């Protein structure tokens, strides 16, 4: 392949307004530096993408989730890579977020601001719309 | 209040051994100009210099590693939500093999006499570099 393909694991993390947990990313980082992200990263040589998961969002969020059911799949290309991303829902949460040097600020959306944003990349808004399609229709 | 809000984006020339530009075609899950050519380059992030915008933005659109030369001109266009300021920066003459994103379909390294002669690139773009070559050679 002239690419390589990496796996990722996002987290779905609500709070009590049912608004989505997302994170932007610093300026120094290697892929989409200064831009709006979901709680997730890649996952490791020989870990579970469940143990991936709460691990990335451990370390970016402070968050100890344990993760649920699978809420999709996101694939999206970089330039030194693809990645095929499976999003778990990480249910609802009460709890102050701590960031790590990974990301600059955090704030919580609701699906409808998701969806009219701009800086949050189209593979996260398209997966948000299927996400919505799949849970109502 | 100002109805629709500025944003100051950043823009990159660069060209081949042969001096063409390099050229990109935007993916059409874009919000804004989905489909259409494009220079490399993008918004300018909250605390970053502009040189520091313009490498970061052609790193992630195109696998080049460039440190920004001059400043080439200005292209200012509005679109529905926004107006954008963008200062285009002279990127010099690369040997790379273009390795784009998820942000951009195809790529094309295209001579300025095309450019003035193509249709798919935005009025705005057409302008500039017709702009850029009388500011060189006249």
Do not use: C
Not at 20 to 39: M, Q, V
Not at 64 to 86: C, H, R, S, Y
């Amino acid at each position: 392949l002239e690419k390589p393909y990496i796996i990722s694991v996002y987290a779905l993390i609500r709070n009590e307004k049912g608004e989505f947990l997302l994170l932007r990313r610093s300026e120094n980082s290697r892929t989409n530096a200064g831009k709006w992200d979901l709680p997730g990263g890649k996952v490791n040589p020989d870990e579970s993408l469940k143990e991936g998961v709460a691990r990335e969002v451990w370390e970016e969020t402070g968050i100890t989730m344990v993760p649920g059911d699978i809420a999709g799949q996101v694939n999206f290309e970089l330039t030194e890579k693809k990645v095929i991303a499976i999003v778990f829902d990480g249910g609802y949460v009460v709890a102050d977020v701590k960031l790590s040097y990974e990301h600059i600020e955090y704030s919580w959306v609701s699906l409808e601001k998701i969806l009219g944003m701009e800086t949050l990349p189209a593979y996260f808004r398209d997966f948000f719309e299927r996400f919505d399609r799949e849970n109502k229709k």
